Amino acid sequence: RFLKVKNWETDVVLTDTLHLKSTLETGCTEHICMGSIMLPVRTKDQLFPLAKEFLDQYYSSIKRFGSKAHMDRLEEVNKEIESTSTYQLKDTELIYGAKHAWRNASRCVGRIQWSKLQVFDARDCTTAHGMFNYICNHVKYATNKGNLRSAITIFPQRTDGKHDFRVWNSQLIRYAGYKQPDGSTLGDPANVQFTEICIQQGWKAPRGRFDVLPLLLQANGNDPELFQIPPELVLEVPIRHPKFDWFKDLGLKWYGLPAVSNMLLEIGGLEFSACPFSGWYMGTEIGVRDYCDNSRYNILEEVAKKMDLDMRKTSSLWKDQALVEINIAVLYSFQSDKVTIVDHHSATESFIKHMENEYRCRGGCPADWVWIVPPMSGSITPVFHQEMLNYRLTPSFEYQPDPWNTHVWKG
Amino acid sequence: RFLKVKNWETDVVLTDTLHLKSTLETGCTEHICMGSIMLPTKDQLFPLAKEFLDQYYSSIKRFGSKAHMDRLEEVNKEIESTSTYQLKDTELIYGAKHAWRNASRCVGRIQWSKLQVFDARDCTTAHGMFNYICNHVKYATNKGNLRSAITIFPQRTDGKHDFRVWNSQLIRYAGYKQPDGSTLGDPANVQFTEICIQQGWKAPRGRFDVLPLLLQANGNDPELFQIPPELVLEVPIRHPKFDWFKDLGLKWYGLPAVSNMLLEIGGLEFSACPFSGWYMGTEIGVRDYCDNSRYNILEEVAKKMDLDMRKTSSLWKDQALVEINIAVLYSFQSDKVTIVDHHSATESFIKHMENEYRCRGGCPADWVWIVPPMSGSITPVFHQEMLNYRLTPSFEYQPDPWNTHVW
Ligand code: HEM
Ligand code: HEM
Ligand SMILES: Cc1cc(N)nc(CCc2c(F)ccc(CCCN(C)C)c2F)c1
Ligand SMILES: Cc1cc(N)nc(CCc2c(F)ccc(CCCN(C)C)c2F)c1
Ligand SMILES: C[C@H](O)[C@H](O)[C@H]1CNc2nc(N)[nH]c(=O)c2N1
Ligand SMILES: C[C@H](O)[C@H](O)[C@H]1CNc2nc(N)[nH]c(=O)c2N1
Ligand SMILES: [Zn+2]
């Protein structure tokens, strides 16, 4: 079968055949679409078909499908699976798997970069201190004095699910949040639960509005341990506005390196439960979501006050006015400090080019419109007008439950 | 199978049981989600009639009553005999209101029960259709205190006698391809503007020419009619801060009235059913004015604002966009024409959703269409999970008539 997607701004029509290689479920049925739902242990039984499929993909990409190396590798993985119940990826396969998990991430607007990913093999790690050292080197390499470089560090794969490697942080760099007795929140409200865990584990919290959280690292299913990222490795950007000199007095900053650390990387049926990856920000992640979500820092009111907008009626669009100015300030500050950032116009335009290229060279590009379209100015970016097919390919990044809900504490 | 939807801004969780009553299909499968795709006989009819009558008599608390069974019997006998059937006035009103209630892409549905239904099923000619449409337009406009309305022309019979309004909206601006290569007026309507000229219209070739009506009764050739200008309420667009904004020469019309959809009630098909409500500001300010394939005025507004259009990262488009949408709301409000900003309308829809989940067990909703095309995440609907499914009675798309008309 062939499926067509249409861009309703340009009338470009693209034909998807890649969806035929989709295995996992979407959550939708013929009778209900779960397209806007946020969130829609493995034996030798199912593992070799998952392995074989990945290895067929791998050897096809290197133009070696059917070769002796291909057949021998399948043979080697088969015996290793029956002998040991799992298998180990070659370095080349790990690199390929990690790049394609990013390439397959249908919610990621930044995938034009998928092939320039620095893969750090951390599968020889055994302890939380070792994890901290790998993560520090990741942070230093990826930050690169503001000239950000995409990187992923891959810790040992799951075995029996009782010895998991986990980074308990959702992101490697993230600000603490503190629930005050009066009900207000100091810092990032999205991080209150994790902040409280860190404090319980012995973190001495500064209790400021932009405290970089400690790393909480779990090696081999042991209880997690706390580590402070060297501050010299944490690049931060004070937020000022190019016209509004009072904007700096809001006291805002953000960190430069977005590094997701709580997802699971699936490659050939293997599960990498600790695989922190990082790229660079699209401005709206900070300016729109982090700063202006009602349940995040929520600065719209105070910004709109300082701008002296008509805040009595929503139809003055005072929220939309402030939102743009905040987002100008984020992009201005990062560029002024020469820290890599991309605005939503550039990023969406690149994604369209990437997506068209993928359809031509690959037969498709799974894309989740709900997530691709930026959270401001949606229809003046070209992704808004682009029809997209969402389906799940492997290798893939998957969600996993927060470890404090599953972890069996040693004491 | 009893599904939950979470609002991630408020953690409010709603349980959806209404989706199990869904009938038609979404276009999605377990292998592929098509959520962002724009457009995915006597034996067929009586189950459709029975399903609708069942929900109707349940809605009036007479399910399983003699009146229910008799009507089921009566319609059953009518389909057996005439191969179709006719809705009582009460069922037609209920069916139309519920087609709006079920429009999963409509953010305005909190108003669904206050719909004025104009029964036009006695209409036989395009002139008669014109008369019904002028009355609709005048009633709905109401001197700018807009009121929701639908006018329902006779139902499809053998598909050769279809009633169709060829316009996509009762009121829309013409589009002309210039010899110069550009487009004057609304580019979205260039093709329809051609068919009006091809059928005899005398185009003023302006930037905001109200298109004439192209009305088709009983499958005959469509006929041109000019809506009385005194019935077409328009709002000149000025900014409450930029005096130069008036010189852009922008106006829009007050009455959004979709005329090309198909209303399905109890298996019956109403191919001509223009309905109207009132605008959300962003439809005009974001889509009509700022889409690249439409009036596409961002450049000119940004220039007048003297924004730095050298780099996208100055967010000059975003700044201009906000101001254009401030002007649209300000202009409609100042002229006392009903309009709703995207903040109010999405807040109302959240309240509507909660109302529907409480009193109905669900609300089918299409996130891709419900979230406004600007400032998405600062509106509550962005953080609202939504289940999309197809309920009937429903509004449906249909082929453009010129592609089908046996001339
Ligand atoms: C290099 C620059 C990058 C940019 C500009 C970018 C942009 C984005 C944005 C804006 C989102 C939406 C996230 C949100 O709203 O919270 C996203 C999602 C995502 N990104 Fe990228 N990204 C980049 C790099 C990467 C890399 C290096 C990876 C992995 C190796 C990655 C994997 C993902 C995944 C898996 C998601 C979806 C998360 C989910 O499924 O919920 N991205 N990306
Ligand atoms: C009264 C105020 C109303 C408001 C503010 C409103 C708002 C909207 C908006 C913004 C859209 C997206 C349309 C687009 O972007 O082109 C929409 C879609 C829609 N509206 Fe409403 N609407 C209203 C009244 C009505 C009425 C009275 C009906 C029918 C009786 C209706 C039926 C629909 C349908 C069927 C769609 C989706 C069409 C599709 O499936 O693609 N609306 N509405
Ligand atoms: C690598 C990278 C680049 C970039 N531009 N931004 C980020 C942070 C955003 C982001 C992702 F991308 C991917 C995943 C998550 C976690 C999702 C959290 N959700 C469910 C509330 C994320 F929060 C990371
Ligand atoms: C009754 C009403 C209220 C309001 N606020 N706006 C409108 C016009 C938008 C609109 C709809 F709502 C419903 C349907 C269409 C047609 C769809 C056009 N698509 C496919 C480009 C529409 F274009 C109509
Ligand atoms: C309910 C809805 O699915 C949820 O709010 C989604 C919408 N789209 C998004 N898109 C991005 N990029 N990031 C998000 O967190 C979300 N949230
Ligand atoms: C491709 C995509 O489905 C298309 O651009 C949609 C997106 N969401 C929309 N939402 C609304 N309200 N109106 C639209 O026309 C569209 N267009
Ligand atoms: Zn779907």
Side-chain angles (χ1 to χ4, degrees):
Chain A
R1 205 189 330 104
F2 299 76
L3 293 168
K4 287 165 25 190
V5 290
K6 173 167 173 181
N7 186 295
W8 289 85
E9 182 192 337
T10 68
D11 274 277
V12 171
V13 172
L14 299 175
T15 308
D16 187 291
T17 48
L18 186 62
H19 72 279
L20 301 170
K21 307 293 184 181
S22 175
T23 57
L24 323 169
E25 298 181 318
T26 68
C28 306
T29 78
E30 278 91 341
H31 295 107
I32 203 159
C33 177
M34 313 253 300
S36 72
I37 306 300
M38 167 110 44
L39 315 173
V41 49
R42 188 172 269 165
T43 60
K44 61 177 73 279
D45 205 310
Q46 56 266 54
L47 185 55
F48 186 76
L50 293 179
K52 178 185 192 306
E53 211 256 302
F54 167 71
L55 291 169
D56 293 346
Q57 291 172 18
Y58 172 67
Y59 278 86
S60 283
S61 76
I62 67 172
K63 279 216 166 80
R64 295 298 186 272
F65 184 93
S67 58
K68 189 177 185 298
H70 184 197
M71 293 303 110
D72 290 353
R73 184 56 180 155
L74 291 177
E75 257 293 273
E76 178 180 49
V77 169
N78 175 241
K79 303 168 62 183
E80 186 176 348
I81 286 174
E82 59 191 11
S83 152
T84 81
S85 240
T86 183
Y87 71 106
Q88 298 302 318
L89 299 174
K90 304 306 194 179
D91 287 11
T92 52
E93 298 165 351
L94 183 74
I95 293 161
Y96 171 94
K99 285 175 183 208
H100 274 73
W102 184 10
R103 191 186 193 176
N104 292 342
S106 62
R107 288 176 171 178
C108 176
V109 77
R111 282 181 278 166
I112 193 159
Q113 299 284 337
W114 72 267
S115 69
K116 297 105 180 224
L117 173 65
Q118 185 54 233
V119 178
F120 291 117
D121 191 345
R123 290 176 298 171
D124 67 5
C125 188
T126 68
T127 71
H129 278 82
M131 296 180 58
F132 170 71
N133 189 62
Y134 267 114
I135 289 168
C136 283
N137 293 349
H138 181 138
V139 170
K140 195 174 194 169
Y141 172 94
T143 301
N144 190 31
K145 294 190 179 191
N147 186 13
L148 270 46
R149 296 184 286 206
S150 316
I152 178 157
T153 297
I154 299 170
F155 289 107
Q157 69 214 38
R158 173 169 294 149
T159 55
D160 64 350
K162 301 178 189 175
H163 296 69
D164 286 1
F165 285 66
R166 298 293 298 276
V167 177
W168 284 34
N169 315 50
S170 53
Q171 292 182 29
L172 299 181
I173 302 181
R174 245 202 154 167
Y175 295 120
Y178 310 91
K179 202 76 179 301
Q180 309 278 59
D182 72 357
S184 57
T185 296
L186 172 61
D188 196 334
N191 303 324
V192 176
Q193 188 186 16
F194 177 71
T195 299
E196 277 153 15
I197 296 174
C198 293
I199 287 163
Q200 176 183 350
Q201 296 310 303
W203 186 51
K204 290 302 175 297
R207 306 189 63 83
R209 191 162 71 136
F210 297 105
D211 302 336
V212 172
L213 280 161
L215 293 170
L216 192 49
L217 306 180
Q218 161 182 2
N220 206 238
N222 301 311
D223 290 352
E225 305 171 20
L226 284 172
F227 304 91
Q228 171 201 119
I229 306 175
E232 59 264 41
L233 264 38
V234 179
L235 182 55
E236 291 182 295
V237 179
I239 305 304
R240 59 282 196 188
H241 189 279
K243 317 283 250 304
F244 300 151
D245 190 61
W246 53 258
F247 200 101
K248 66 183 189 305
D249 297 318
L250 295 172
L252 308 168
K253 57 178 169 180
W254 205 250
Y255 49 90
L257 177 72
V260 164
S261 55
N262 59 0
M263 289 188 86
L264 182 149
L265 166 54
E266 181 186 311
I267 301 171
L270 306 184
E271 300 181 312
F272 297 91
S273 54
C275 58
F277 53 85
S278 64
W280 53 82
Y281 268 113
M282 189 171 66
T284 52
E285 302 182 65
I286 313 163
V288 182
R289 306 300 313 284
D290 298 325
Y291 282 163
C292 297
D293 270 9
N294 289 328
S295 68
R296 299 295 303 286
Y297 278 83
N298 190 29
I299 68 175
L300 278 182
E301 301 246 22
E302 192 194 18
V303 167
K305 264 202 261 290
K306 289 294 190 311
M307 302 185 60
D308 185 68
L309 305 167
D310 196 325
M311 285 184 61
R312 276 180 286 100
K313 270 231 173 73
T314 77
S315 59
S316 69
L317 309 191
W318 62 267
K319 281 190 179 181
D320 318 63
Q321 285 197 280
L323 183 64
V324 176
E325 295 309 326
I326 294 161
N327 274 273
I328 290 169
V330 169
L331 291 164
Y332 176 69
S333 296
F334 270 65
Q335 296 160 345
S336 282
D337 284 358
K338 299 165 156 55
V339 182
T340 300
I341 196 167
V342 65
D343 62 80
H344 52 287
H345 302 289
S346 176
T348 51
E349 176 183 27
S350 293
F351 180 77
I352 289 297
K353 290 166 177 179
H354 167 65
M355 187 191 168
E356 299 180 324
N357 188 37
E358 287 287 78
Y359 271 79
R360 275 191 272 95
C361 86
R362 199 192 193 188
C365 177
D368 179 347
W369 194 101
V370 158
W371 274 66
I372 293 299
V373 176
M376 68 181 294
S377 309
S379 58
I380 62 164
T381 70
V383 292
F384 181 97
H385 306 273
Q386 179 62 58
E387 288 183 346
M388 294 169 192
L389 293 176
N390 195 24
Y391 46 93
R392 301 194 86 24
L393 303 166
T394 53
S396 68
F397 290 107
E398 301 296 351
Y399 282 100
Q400 45 184 2
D402 287 320
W404 51 90
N405 299 330
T406 59
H407 182 66
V408 164
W409 283 90
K410 274 68 193 170
Chain B
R1 171 162 170 173
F2 287 43
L3 294 172
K4 290 204 166 90
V5 284
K6 177 177 179 175
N7 179 297
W8 290 86
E9 187 203 326
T10 66
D11 289 313
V12 170
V13 182
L14 303 174
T15 306
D16 186 292
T17 48
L18 185 70
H19 73 279
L20 301 170
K21 288 230 292 294
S22 159
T23 46
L24 309 163
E25 290 172 9
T26 68
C28 302
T29 86
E30 328 81 36
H31 294 271
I32 182 159
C33 170
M34 295 207 151
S36 80
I37 304 293
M38 182 93 74
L39 325 153
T41 75
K42 294 192 187 187
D43 298 283
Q44 309 154 321
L45 189 51
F46 183 63
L48 293 174
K50 179 164 187 299
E51 164 200 3
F52 167 76
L53 291 170
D54 283 3
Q55 67 185 88
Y56 174 71
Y57 277 90
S58 163
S59 81
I60 70 168
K61 295 167 302 167
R62 255 158 181 75
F63 193 94
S65 77
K66 192 159 202 307
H68 181 188
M69 306 299 105
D70 287 342
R71 179 55 175 162
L72 231 57
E73 149 93 328
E74 169 183 45
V75 164
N76 174 51
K77 279 180 168 167
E78 196 177 321
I79 298 175
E80 288 279 342
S81 165
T82 60
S83 72
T84 177
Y85 69 108
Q86 304 290 324
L87 294 165
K88 304 288 172 200
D89 294 351
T90 58
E91 308 163 343
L92 180 92
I93 295 156
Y94 170 93
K97 292 180 181 200
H98 274 70
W100 185 10
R101 196 181 191 176
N102 300 340
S104 72
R105 294 178 159 169
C106 176
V107 71
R109 284 179 281 166
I110 192 179
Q111 293 286 295
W112 73 269
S113 63
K114 301 179 284 273
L115 178 61
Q116 184 60 233
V117 178
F118 291 120
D119 189 350
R121 296 178 285 170
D122 65 356
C123 188
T124 69
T125 68
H127 274 88
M129 296 177 68
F130 172 76
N131 186 45
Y132 270 112
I133 288 166
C134 295
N135 291 344
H136 182 133
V137 166
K138 190 178 197 169
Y139 175 89
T141 303
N142 188 29
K143 303 162 180 284
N145 184 13
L146 306 178
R147 299 177 291 194
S148 301
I150 182 162
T151 299
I152 299 167
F153 292 102
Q155 74 210 38
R156 176 171 290 127
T157 50
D158 48 43
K160 256 58 195 170
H161 303 21
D162 278 11
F163 287 71
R164 293 291 306 261
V165 173
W166 284 34
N167 317 47
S168 51
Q169 291 189 27
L170 300 185
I171 298 177
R172 244 195 154 178
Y173 295 121
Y176 314 95
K177 274 168 175 294
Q178 300 282 58
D180 153 73
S182 63
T183 291
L184 180 63
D186 199 321
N189 303 317
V190 169
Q191 189 181 7
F192 182 73
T193 303
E194 272 177 321
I195 297 170
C196 292
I197 300 163
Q198 175 189 42
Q199 283 268 88
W201 189 49
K202 176 162 51 186
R205 297 196 91 90
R207 195 186 179 191
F208 292 106
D209 307 340
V210 174
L211 280 169
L213 292 175
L214 232 213
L215 303 187
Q216 166 187 326
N218 212 38
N220 302 319
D221 294 346
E223 306 190 20
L224 283 178
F225 302 89
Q226 178 202 38
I227 306 169
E230 64 274 34
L231 299 189
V232 185
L233 183 52
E234 293 177 294
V235 177
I237 306 298
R238 58 279 194 191
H239 196 277
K241 212 123 304 174
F242 301 159
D243 277 315
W244 53 258
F245 202 101
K246 92 178 97 296
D247 295 315
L248 298 170
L250 304 174
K251 60 177 158 182
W252 207 251
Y253 51 91
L255 188 71
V258 167
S259 50
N260 63 359
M261 292 194 82
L262 187 154
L263 162 62
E264 187 201 308
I265 297 162
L268 304 179
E269 286 180 320
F270 299 93
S271 45
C273 58
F275 56 85
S276 63
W278 51 80
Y279 266 117
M280 186 166 67
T282 54
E283 304 175 72
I284 306 171
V286 186
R287 298 310 302 293
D288 295 323
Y289 279 166
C290 292
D291 274 2
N292 269 284
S293 58
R294 303 288 300 286
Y295 278 87
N296 184 38
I297 73 184
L298 274 185
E299 306 242 1
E300 182 177 2
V301 168
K303 272 159 53 182
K304 291 254 191 131
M305 291 176 67
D306 221 356
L307 303 174
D308 177 34
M309 301 167 47
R310 287 180 282 187
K311 322 174 278 68
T312 65
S313 51
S314 75
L315 312 193
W316 63 265
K317 293 192 170 182
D318 312 74
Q319 264 187 297
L321 177 62
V322 173
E323 300 298 336
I324 295 173
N325 281 266
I326 287 168
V328 169
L329 293 161
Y330 175 73
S331 290
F332 271 60
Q333 283 169 339
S334 291
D335 287 0
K336 228 67 52 51
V337 183
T338 308
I339 191 157
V340 69
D341 63 70
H342 51 290
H343 301 298
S344 190
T346 57
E347 191 211 354
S348 289
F349 181 76
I350 296 294
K351 188 192 182 188
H352 173 62
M353 263 192 72
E354 293 163 4
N355 284 334
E356 294 290 85
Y357 272 85
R358 169 169 38 87
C359 314
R360 206 193 186 186
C363 181
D366 180 345
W367 194 103
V368 176
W369 277 63
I370 297 286
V371 176
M374 73 181 269
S375 308
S377 65
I378 58 168
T379 66
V381 292
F382 176 96
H383 314 270
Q384 181 67 58
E385 294 185 335
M386 295 171 191
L387 294 167
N388 194 28
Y389 49 90
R390 306 238 305 199
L391 298 182
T392 194
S394 62
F395 296 103
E396 299 296 344
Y397 289 100
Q398 50 179 354
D400 276 328
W402 45 92
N403 307 325
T404 335
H405 185 43
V406 273
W407 273 91

